[PDB]
Design a protein around this nucleic acid. Structure first.
Ligand SMILES: [Mg+2]
Ligand SMILES: [Mg+2]
Ligand SMILES: [Mg+2]
Ligand SMILES: [Mg+2]
Ligand SMILES: [Mg+2]
Ligand SMILES: [Mg+2]
Ligand SMILES: [Mg+2]
Ligand SMILES: [Mg+2]
Ligand SMILES: [Mg+2]
Ligand SMILES: [Mg+2]
Ligand SMILES: [Mg+2]
Ligand SMILES: [Mg+2]
Ligand SMILES: [Mg+2]
Ligand SMILES: [Mg+2]
Ligand SMILES: [Mg+2]
Ligand SMILES: [Mg+2]
Ligand SMILES: [Mg+2]
Ligand SMILES: [Mg+2]
Ligand SMILES: [Mg+2]
Ligand SMILES: [Mg+2]
Ligand SMILES: [Mg+2]
Ligand SMILES: [Mg+2]
Ligand SMILES: [Mg+2]
Ligand SMILES: [Mg+2]
Ligand SMILES: [Mg+2]
Ligand SMILES: [Mg+2]
Ligand SMILES: [Mg+2]
Ligand SMILES: [Mg+2]
Ligand SMILES: [Mg+2]
Ligand SMILES: [Mg+2]
Ligand SMILES: [Mg+2]
Ligand SMILES: [Mg+2]
Ligand SMILES: [Mg+2]
Ligand SMILES: [Mg+2]
Ligand SMILES: [Mg+2]
Ligand SMILES: [Mg+2]
Ligand SMILES: [Mg+2]
Ligand SMILES: [Mg+2]
Ligand SMILES: [Mg+2]
Ligand SMILES: [Mg+2]
Ligand SMILES: [Mg+2]
Ligand SMILES: [Mg+2]
Ligand SMILES: [Mg+2]
Ligand SMILES: [Mg+2]
Ligand SMILES: [Mg+2]
Ligand SMILES: [Mg+2]
Ligand SMILES: [Mg+2]
Ligand SMILES: [Mg+2]
Ligand SMILES: [Mg+2]
Ligand SMILES: [Mg+2]
Ligand SMILES: [Mg+2]
Ligand SMILES: [Mg+2]
Ligand SMILES: [Mg+2]
Ligand SMILES: [Mg+2]
Ligand SMILES: [Mg+2]
Ligand SMILES: [Mg+2]
Ligand SMILES: [Mg+2]
Ligand SMILES: [Mg+2]
Ligand SMILES: [Mg+2]
Ligand SMILES: [Mg+2]
Ligand SMILES: [Mg+2]
Ligand SMILES: [Mg+2]
Ligand SMILES: [Mg+2]
Ligand SMILES: [Mg+2]
Ligand SMILES: [Mg+2]
Ligand SMILES: [Mg+2]
Ligand SMILES: [Mg+2]
Ligand SMILES: [Mg+2]
Ligand SMILES: [Mg+2]
Ligand SMILES: [Mg+2]
Ligand SMILES: [Mg+2]
Ligand SMILES: [Mg+2]
Ligand SMILES: [Mg+2]
Ligand SMILES: [Mg+2]
Ligand SMILES: [Mg+2]
Ligand SMILES: [Mg+2]
Ligand SMILES: [Mg+2]
Ligand SMILES: [Mg+2]
Ligand SMILES: [Mg+2]
Ligand SMILES: [Mg+2]
Ligand SMILES: [Mg+2]
Ligand SMILES: [Mg+2]
Ligand SMILES: [Mg+2]
Ligand SMILES: [Mg+2]
Ligand SMILES: [Mg+2]
Ligand SMILES: [Mg+2]
Ligand SMILES: [Mg+2]
Ligand SMILES: [Mg+2]
Ligand SMILES: [Mg+2]
Ligand SMILES: [Mg+2]
Ligand SMILES: [Mg+2]
Ligand SMILES: [Mg+2]
Ligand SMILES: [Mg+2]
Ligand SMILES: [Mg+2]
Ligand SMILES: [Mg+2]
Ligand SMILES: [Mg+2]
Ligand SMILES: [Mg+2]
Ligand SMILES: [Mg+2]
Ligand SMILES: [Mg+2]
Ligand SMILES: [Mg+2]
Ligand SMILES: [Mg+2]
Ligand SMILES: [Mg+2]
Ligand SMILES: [Mg+2]
Ligand SMILES: [Mg+2]
Ligand SMILES: [Mg+2]
Ligand SMILES: [Mg+2]
Ligand SMILES: [Mg+2]
Ligand SMILES: [Mg+2]
Ligand SMILES: [Mg+2]
Ligand SMILES: [Mg+2]
Ligand SMILES: [Mg+2]
Ligand SMILES: [Mg+2]
Ligand SMILES: [Mg+2]
Ligand SMILES: [Mg+2]
Ligand SMILES: [Mg+2]
Ligand SMILES: [Mg+2]
Ligand SMILES: [Mg+2]
Ligand SMILES: [Mg+2]
Ligand SMILES: [Mg+2]
Ligand SMILES: [Mg+2]
Ligand SMILES: [Mg+2]
Ligand SMILES: [Mg+2]
Ligand SMILES: [Mg+2]
Ligand SMILES: [Mg+2]
Ligand SMILES: [Mg+2]
Ligand SMILES: [Mg+2]
Ligand SMILES: [Mg+2]
Ligand SMILES: [Mg+2]
Ligand SMILES: [Mg+2]
Ligand SMILES: [Mg+2]
Ligand SMILES: [Mg+2]
Ligand SMILES: [Mg+2]
Ligand SMILES: [Mg+2]
Ligand SMILES: [Mg+2]
Ligand SMILES: [Mg+2]
Ligand SMILES: [Mg+2]
Ligand SMILES: [Mg+2]
Ligand SMILES: [Mg+2]
Ligand SMILES: [Mg+2]
Ligand SMILES: [Mg+2]
Ligand SMILES: [Mg+2]
Ligand SMILES: [Mg+2]
Ligand SMILES: [Mg+2]
Ligand SMILES: [Mg+2]
Ligand SMILES: [Mg+2]
Ligand SMILES: [Mg+2]
Ligand SMILES: [Mg+2]
Ligand SMILES: [Mg+2]
Ligand SMILES: [Mg+2]
Ligand SMILES: [Mg+2]
Ligand SMILES: [Mg+2]
Ligand SMILES: [Mg+2]
Ligand SMILES: [Mg+2]
Ligand SMILES: [Mg+2]
Ligand SMILES: [Mg+2]
Ligand SMILES: [Mg+2]
Ligand SMILES: [Mg+2]
Ligand SMILES: [Mg+2]
Ligand SMILES: [Mg+2]
Ligand SMILES: [Mg+2]
Ligand SMILES: [Mg+2]
Ligand SMILES: [Mg+2]
Ligand SMILES: [Mg+2]
Ligand SMILES: [Mg+2]
Ligand SMILES: [Mg+2]
Ligand SMILES: [Mg+2]
Ligand SMILES: [Mg+2]
Ligand SMILES: [Mg+2]
Ligand SMILES: [Mg+2]
Ligand SMILES: [Mg+2]
Ligand SMILES: [Mg+2]
Ligand SMILES: [Mg+2]
Ligand SMILES: [Mg+2]
Ligand SMILES: [Mg+2]
Ligand SMILES: [Mg+2]
Ligand SMILES: [Mg+2]
Ligand SMILES: [Mg+2]
Ligand SMILES: [Mg+2]
Ligand SMILES: [Mg+2]
Ligand SMILES: [Mg+2]
Ligand SMILES: [Mg+2]
Ligand SMILES: [Mg+2]
Ligand SMILES: [Mg+2]
Ligand SMILES: [Mg+2]
Ligand SMILES: [Mg+2]
Ligand SMILES: [Mg+2]
Ligand SMILES: [Mg+2]
Ligand SMILES: [Mg+2]
Ligand SMILES: [Mg+2]
Ligand SMILES: [Mg+2]
Ligand SMILES: [Mg+2]
Lengths: 273, 47
RNA sequence: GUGGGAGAGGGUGGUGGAAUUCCCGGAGUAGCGGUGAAAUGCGCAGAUACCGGGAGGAACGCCGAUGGCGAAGGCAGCCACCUGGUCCACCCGUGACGCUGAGGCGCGAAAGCGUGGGGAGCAAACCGGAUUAGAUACCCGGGUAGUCCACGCCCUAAACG
RNA sequence: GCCGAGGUGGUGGAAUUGGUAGACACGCUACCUUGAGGUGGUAGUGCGCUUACGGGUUCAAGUCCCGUCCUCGGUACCA
RNA sequence: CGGGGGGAACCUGGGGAACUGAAACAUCUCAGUACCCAGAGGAGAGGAAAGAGAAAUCGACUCCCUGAGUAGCGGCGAGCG
RNA sequence: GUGGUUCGUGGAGCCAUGGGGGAAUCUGGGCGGACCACCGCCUAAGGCUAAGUACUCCGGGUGACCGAUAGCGCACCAGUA
RNA sequence: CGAGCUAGCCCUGGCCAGGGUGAAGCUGGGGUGAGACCCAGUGGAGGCCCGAACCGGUGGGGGAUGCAAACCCCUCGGAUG
RNA sequence: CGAAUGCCGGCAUGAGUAACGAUAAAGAGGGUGAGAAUCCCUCUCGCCGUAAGCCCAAGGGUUCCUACGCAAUGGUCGUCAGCGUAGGGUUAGGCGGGACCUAAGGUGAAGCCGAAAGGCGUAGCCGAAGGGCAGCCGGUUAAUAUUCCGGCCCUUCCCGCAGGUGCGAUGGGGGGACGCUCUAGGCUAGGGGGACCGGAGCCAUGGACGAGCCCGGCCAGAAGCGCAGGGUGGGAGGUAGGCAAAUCCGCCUCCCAACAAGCUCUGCGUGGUGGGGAAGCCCGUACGGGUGACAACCCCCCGAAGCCAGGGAGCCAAGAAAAGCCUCUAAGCACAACCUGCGGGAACCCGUACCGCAAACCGACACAGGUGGGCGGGUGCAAGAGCACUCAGGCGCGCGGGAGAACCCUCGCCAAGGAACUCUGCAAGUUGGCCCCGUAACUUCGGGAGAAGGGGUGCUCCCUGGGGUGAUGAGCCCCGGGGAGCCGCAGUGAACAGGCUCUGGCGACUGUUUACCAAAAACACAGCUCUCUGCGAACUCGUAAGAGGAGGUAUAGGGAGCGACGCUUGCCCGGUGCCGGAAGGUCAAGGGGAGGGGUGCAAGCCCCGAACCGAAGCCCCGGUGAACGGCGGCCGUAACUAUAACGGUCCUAAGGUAGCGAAAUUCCUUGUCGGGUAAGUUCCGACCUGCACGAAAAGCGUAACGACCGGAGCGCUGUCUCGGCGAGGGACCCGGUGAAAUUGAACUGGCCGUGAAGAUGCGGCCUACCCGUGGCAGGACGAAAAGACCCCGUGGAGCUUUACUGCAGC
RNA sequence: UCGAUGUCGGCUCGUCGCAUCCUGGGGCUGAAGAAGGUCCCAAGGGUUGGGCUGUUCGCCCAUUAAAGCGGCACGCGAGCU
């Protein structure tokens, strides 16, 4: 869990690569990949709408199953645990008995050979997925639906999870990985346990190039621009912001809240980040 | 040292050529303009 | 060796109620706190005291002893798993196979350090109220590290009989 | 060299033209508490002269003005 | 059966600047101009009063002359009309 | 809320209309410069309609128009080299 | 009207003589209660090293109506990212 | 028209001036011709040879070939030509494209959006240097040739026969189908050597008739076979998935081979046949042709980066699509249809000349610049695409001849000295490859390191070890070892090839940057912190639809600072920002109508309007520092003095902690002291009076790194004392060609004056025959550019904000 | 002089003034001698090499007969830096 390196170069000093022990299969499931279009952060008009992107490895997209409920009651055996370049986590390849192959995003604690199933039935065990209403309160759970049948949305990122705090009416009270407190509808599926590859946050990029491999290009500071360019540009040697700090588009960037206030989902929230 | 003209026949038809002009309203007017000025060539040679 | 015994001895995983604190709701009004006496602070934007609902962290009351276990440091709600030492009995086996121990190795309260977490109460530093000639203190109101978990360091002590 | 605010008790510091030993402190002096000092309590700070200089305004000038000295603050850029 | 597309300038509709002027400049001006777009033609718009507006009056619409730089409008300015 | 008109919010009507409300059919409705009365004018919410007008790619006629540095950019194989 | 120059991104291809250093892992031995670890071999990592191609443009000289509207010479930087 | 740096045109001056475009280089003979340095052929000489040779792709588009031409184009000449005129020349079922596929992207029925114009968009369609697809060797033309011819092979389509089979698709499945580094075994291209094989001819000038010397000893090739290698399990049973179906694929279970065993595919070998085939001599070829020959046609060795190819391994950053192809079934049809084999017929459009690192492309030029892929021989040097010479082949760069001044450029060498040069060792020089010995502080333990500093280096002889290929052997190739000796000043004998050390600053580091005056201490960067964001996310672009974010989900995404790492990062919440706050106050439209007015006989119509309810915002209450930001003054005091641990007092929101400090910050300033030097405004170490450091616009440190900027030493030098000589290319003279800015007109001297204040031009005086060449720059307020500095203009523009007024956005 | 009169310093090359740093010739002296001090005449010649700083200047090391001061667009950039 987290490879380190001798310092036989600079930057090989602080580098850290993930441990790949959990990985069973070294090439993906041909059935389950589509190629994906790399945007470079350019939207349909050829305009950059997210800065500092592009470069980075050719990448095959793995189509992963975010609705477990098409297969209700059909068991499946976990066939392998794989590397997915498109996400923080690991994907499990698993074979349904009725012969369909799907990718689940791998819970921690899941191992190859395990027997897994989703439905309002089903044991409470790692990898099984149920309607939220049927998980015992106090469970920790991942890959959670936010509206019934709409796809899993919350807690898909390596090492994240969420927790059932209580039930009220048609809805259950979820603690999100943000610490926000949310009612989610009881009918929403979720699959028990946390996401794993939790050691993920401790990997140390370690050198400039290695940030490029991830397709994120250099990020140049406001301060280091001119005034045509940023609210912080201009000013001889350095200078401080000399105004409350701002985005290139000139809104305030320290503490100013951007959530819409009159948003209808406010009726469903109790907490923050 | 590398100058601004790097002839590419495909580029030239694709960019300034006839169908290109006729695709856009702006371009239809170029043609309209040139035709009315009496140009011998409404659009570059290319090939 | 065999047969037994006591115990907060250690490690892992669970799990319980009490209380504090914070949140919602209900009810309810002008003060609560705090001290040597006060002030700072909290409170008609509805505090305190009361009832209900919930979240969370830490510590385990009575049993509890001038008691027990451990080589030491140390160990105290309950339950399970894994495990150390130790005493008694019958007098069975090996046959001096012993004692000590420079170095070496390991363990080592608290505080401190690193990377993650976690953070209720307490609280170095820090702010404020008092006291005082003054008070960078004692007392009061606040309060961050830390106190807790994991992994890794540190290796000290009135580490004392 | 150039514009802004200042010079007052022993000290630090106040005052709209109406002064006044002059706010308020702290020095200090007399007594008191103490065996003695300090802390602490009680009641006063010039010999009928001065608020930097000296010279106008006013019925009155620490207060407004005029220049002189000193302080402090700011400035002396393109060259 | 029709449409499509082209046409010097002219017409109507949708949209629509700035320089400049005001001896600065914001209302105002330049100006519903330049221009972009859609449509029409040999012309196009308009047209047969829910009109004018003071006389008991005129009678559809266009165009010219004139009323008249009048009536008015206007940082009651420049100016517009 | 705006646009049009000479009308720039002015006493601001008339014509038009993006938004809200929302009638009546001659004893009905619009207008005559806020509004009210009186006296008049006119009949909205369907449509078409020659001529008189604008222009000049084109043909002609005519010039106190130019005469090859002029007159169209081009008198000439020019929107060419 | 332009991204046939330049800048970034996307898709699909290609290029990088040779030499040097010798990471993890593995294997063996040592070590130990079991380890950590040590040594030897092997192994062949890296915005590692020297250096052509390719990419630059460091200092100096020359050129300055130039060979050239940015060049030439010597020297220098990177060269599996 | 006389002036507008006027416009158009013509013609001057500079001037027979500068230049004639790489310093790779020329000489003569012969020919042709009106005319020859410049065309042609010979011989000699020089230059390129990872190219300055050869192939391809772009782009160009007749430049190709030949005949006849020389006005112009050619930097001179021209008989020549890429130039003028004319004629000729480009041949494909297999090469490249298209009657194939799909990528980004484009387009776009369905659909959505937008005043119009239009924007978007699923399927589909288009789109290639990627995937798929069937030709190899030779000959021939003046000029084309995988195109024509010759020989040997192959593809599709149509029709037929034979044999086989549930046939059948735009639908299901498989496959296609993949990164990067390293890399095994076998091959091949390619190359070296041979006493073996074939071959004209040769014996010079002292020696050699010799296992002499110089030349050559291959290419393509179906089936078959051989060798190397790729791919691949076989049968049954069930079956709920692969939007219908399936016998296929998937999945569960049972039995057989575990192995290429077999089946299958590709590579190379060999192959029937076919084809080439040197030096040299001769023919005259402008270029080839004849002969050598009836050629020989073999052995060994070196060996890819290429081939077998979906090979192997490791790694993290996790590595296109679709069709061809195989499979499965659906309708439908089963005389059809498809499969396999043989046969016959059918097989279209476009390109092909030539240039192609360049005189034919991009650079106004026959321009020292730019331009993607492939091949790129030999020897030596550690290797190599490096460097020196050289093959094939290709060039001597489209002005020449002389002379041998100054000056310049490029180059070589120097007595003694050795940085004294100078802002600065700038420049140059020193060093230099490889083998061995050796190698410090400090360090993040890797480094520092090529630290430093040393020794070796040729050739001949003897002995000698191991490898590869051959067999276990010679032969050939590779890596060594020991001994004795030869020669010169010197053996990496020429060419390519680090000068080193100490010490500060700044930035951690490799990177990036002002194309064209700045490469940096700037930007970036891993990493730290803050903040926003629950997902139809925030945020960005768009009027919108849509889109990016992301087919991502708080270990994620956006914004902002800081900038590896170590140790750290104080106090102030008054103001500003943001954040929280159900009360309070004020607050627009709207609500409400107390009352008041206009008019009317009136019923009424119309107008105004108080109270009161009525958002956000502001006010107000709080919070907030890695938010914007800020972080005091005066007086006194110790038993020498001096200083003040201590005290007093004014003010503040609070009065700068650690650490650092004459600093990339210190004005005074060359502060003072120490170190260095004979001497040190710089440098280093201190002190602290910090004009005016200070903690993420981070503080203080830090090994390693730097074409960064200071300072010092050694080494070594023409940098210098201080210059001298020599070389080439220019400059000079001659023949050819022949520009330029500038130019009121010129008959254009010095001094003292004078003058709009700096006179060839006015006064006086002095000096002075006319005209040129080569030189120098003091003057013509010399040229150039309507001064960029400065002001002015109610000139402009970019930028800012608590200037004004708007708009988007919220 | 802004339709342009390049600006400190250094190098190079100088030339001139004398208000003389030295050398020559003098008066006075509080000149014994030697050495000076002052003022007088005198522009023929001469007037070093280094450390530091861009520096002018200046300070400093080592010498010197001596280590002069000025002007020439703070002489001199179609002469260099
Ligand atoms: Mg587009
Ligand atoms: Mg940045
Ligand atoms: Mg900047
Ligand atoms: Mg911009
Ligand atoms: Mg801005
Ligand atoms: Mg700023
Ligand atoms: Mg600054
Ligand atoms: Mg700046
Ligand atoms: Mg290039
Ligand atoms: Mg051009
Ligand atoms: Mg092309
Ligand atoms: Mg024509
Ligand atoms: Mg006890
Ligand atoms: Mg005990
Ligand atoms: Mg036990
Ligand atoms: Mg016995
Ligand atoms: Mg301990
Ligand atoms: Mg502890
Ligand atoms: Mg006391
Ligand atoms: Mg507390
Ligand atoms: Mg004890
Ligand atoms: Mg006594
Ligand atoms: Mg007094
Ligand atoms: Mg008085
Ligand atoms: Mg200024
Ligand atoms: Mg039309
Ligand atoms: Mg209109
Ligand atoms: Mg219009
Ligand atoms: Mg329209
Ligand atoms: Mg104006
Ligand atoms: Mg004006
Ligand atoms: Mg103006
Ligand atoms: Mg108007
Ligand atoms: Mg007609
Ligand atoms: Mg008509
Ligand atoms: Mg009509
Ligand atoms: Mg009409
Ligand atoms: Mg009509
Ligand atoms: Mg009529
Ligand atoms: Mg008025
Ligand atoms: Mg108007
Ligand atoms: Mg209007
Ligand atoms: Mg107005
Ligand atoms: Mg009106
Ligand atoms: Mg009316
Ligand atoms: Mg309406
Ligand atoms: Mg009406
Ligand atoms: Mg009317
Ligand atoms: Mg009417
Ligand atoms: Mg008409
Ligand atoms: Mg006509
Ligand atoms: Mg003419
Ligand atoms: Mg003409
Ligand atoms: Mg004439
Ligand atoms: Mg003429
Ligand atoms: Mg003309
Ligand atoms: Mg013509
Ligand atoms: Mg481009
Ligand atoms: Mg490298
Ligand atoms: Mg290198
Ligand atoms: Mg250079
Ligand atoms: Mg020059
Ligand atoms: Mg890359
Ligand atoms: Mg001129
Ligand atoms: Mg003229
Ligand atoms: Mg002439
Ligand atoms: Mg001349
Ligand atoms: Mg000359
Ligand atoms: Mg010449
Ligand atoms: Mg001859
Ligand atoms: Mg000749
Ligand atoms: Mg070669
Ligand atoms: Mg071509
Ligand atoms: Mg051309
Ligand atoms: Mg031609
Ligand atoms: Mg040819
Ligand atoms: Mg030719
Ligand atoms: Mg000619
Ligand atoms: Mg000629
Ligand atoms: Mg020709
Ligand atoms: Mg066809
Ligand atoms: Mg297609
Ligand atoms: Mg489109
Ligand atoms: Mg449509
Ligand atoms: Mg459309
Ligand atoms: Mg293709
Ligand atoms: Mg292809
Ligand atoms: Mg083909
Ligand atoms: Mg073939
Ligand atoms: Mg051939
Ligand atoms: Mg088929
Ligand atoms: Mg002989
Ligand atoms: Mg063969
Ligand atoms: Mg099915
Ligand atoms: Mg494969
Ligand atoms: Mg492989
Ligand atoms: Mg298709
Ligand atoms: Mg079938
Ligand atoms: Mg059927
Ligand atoms: Mg056939
Ligand atoms: Mg051809
Ligand atoms: Mg070239
Ligand atoms: Mg050529
Ligand atoms: Mg030439
Ligand atoms: Mg060229
Ligand atoms: Mg050219
Ligand atoms: Mg190239
Ligand atoms: Mg080669
Ligand atoms: Mg070598
Ligand atoms: Mg090669
Ligand atoms: Mg070479
Ligand atoms: Mg040759
Ligand atoms: Mg020649
Ligand atoms: Mg030449
Ligand atoms: Mg010599
Ligand atoms: Mg010498
Ligand atoms: Mg010597
Ligand atoms: Mg020396
Ligand atoms: Mg000097
Ligand atoms: Mg140098
Ligand atoms: Mg040392
Ligand atoms: Mg060192
Ligand atoms: Mg080392
Ligand atoms: Mg060495
Ligand atoms: Mg030797
Ligand atoms: Mg020798
Ligand atoms: Mg050498
Ligand atoms: Mg050499
Ligand atoms: Mg060398
Ligand atoms: Mg080197
Ligand atoms: Mg410094
Ligand atoms: Mg750097
Ligand atoms: Mg740093
Ligand atoms: Mg660098
Ligand atoms: Mg930069
Ligand atoms: Mg630059
Ligand atoms: Mg520039
Ligand atoms: Mg650099
Ligand atoms: Mg540069
Ligand atoms: Mg979206
Ligand atoms: Mg928007
Ligand atoms: Mg999206
Ligand atoms: Mg997406
Ligand atoms: Mg920074
Ligand atoms: Mg920094
Ligand atoms: Mg504050
Ligand atoms: Mg605040
Ligand atoms: Mg506050
Ligand atoms: Mg309120
Ligand atoms: Mg109302
Ligand atoms: Mg009334
Ligand atoms: Mg409010
Ligand atoms: Mg407040
Ligand atoms: Mg701070
Ligand atoms: Mg104080
Ligand atoms: Mg300070
Ligand atoms: Mg210190
Ligand atoms: Mg200091
Ligand atoms: Mg100093
Ligand atoms: Mg400072
Ligand atoms: Mg220092
Ligand atoms: Mg600073
Ligand atoms: Mg800061
Ligand atoms: Mg520092
Ligand atoms: Mg650098
Ligand atoms: Mg010299
Ligand atoms: Mg010479
Ligand atoms: Mg004369
Ligand atoms: Mg004069
Ligand atoms: Mg005269
Ligand atoms: Mg002359
Ligand atoms: Mg001159
Ligand atoms: Mg001059
Ligand atoms: Mg001017
Ligand atoms: Mg003004
Ligand atoms: Mg202005
Ligand atoms: Mg001037
Ligand atoms: Mg002039
Ligand atoms: Mg001039
Ligand atoms: Mg004299
Ligand atoms: Mg004398
Ligand atoms: Mg004497
Ligand atoms: Mg004497
Ligand atoms: Mg003299
Ligand atoms: Mg003199
Ligand atoms: Mg001197
Ligand atoms: Mg210096
Ligand atoms: Mg000085
Ligand atoms: Mg000066
Ligand atoms: Mg001067
Ligand atoms: Mg100068």
């Amino acid at each position: 869990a987290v490879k380190k390196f001798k310092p036989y170069t600079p930057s090989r000093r602080f580098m850290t690569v993930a441990d790949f022990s959990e990985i069973t299969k070294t090439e993906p499931e041909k059935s389950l990949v589509k190629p994906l279009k790399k945007t470079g952060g350019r939207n349909n008009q050829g305009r950059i709408t997210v800065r500092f992107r592009g470069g980075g490895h050719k990448r095959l997209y793995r189509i992963i199953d975010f609705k477990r409920w098409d297969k209700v009651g059909i068991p499946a055996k976990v066939a392998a645990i794989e590397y997915d370049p498109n996400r923080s986590a690991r994907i499990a390849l698993l074979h349904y008995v009725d012969g369909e192959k799907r990718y689940i995003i791998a819970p921690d604690g899941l191992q190859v050979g395990q027997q897994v199933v989703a439905g309002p039935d089903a044991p409470i065990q790692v990898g099984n997925a149920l309607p939220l209403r049927f998980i015992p309160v106090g469970t920790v759970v991942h890959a959670v639906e936010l509206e019934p049948k709409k796809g899993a949305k919350l807690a898909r990122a390596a090492g994240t999870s969420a927790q059932i705090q209580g039930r009220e009416g048609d809805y259950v009270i979820l603690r999100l990985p943000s610490g926000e407190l949310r009612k989610v509808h009881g009918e929403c599926y979720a699959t028990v346990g946390a996401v794993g590859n939790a050691d993920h946050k401790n990997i140390v990029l370690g050198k400039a190039g290695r940030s490029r491999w991830l397709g994120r290009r250099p990020h140049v500071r406001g301060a280091a621009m001119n005034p045509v360019d940023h609210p912080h540009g201009g000013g001889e040697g350095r200078a401080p912001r000399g105004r409350p700090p701002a985005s290139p588009w000139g809104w305030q960037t320290k503490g100013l809240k951007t959530r819409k206030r009159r948003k209808p989902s406010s009726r469903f929230i109790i907490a923050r980040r | 040292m590398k100058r601004t003209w790097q002839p590419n026949r495909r580029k030239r038809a694709k960019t300034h050529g006839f169908r290109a002009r006729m695709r856009t309203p702006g371009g239809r007017k170029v043609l309209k303009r040139r035709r009315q000025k009496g140009r011998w060539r409404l659009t570059p040679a290319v090939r």
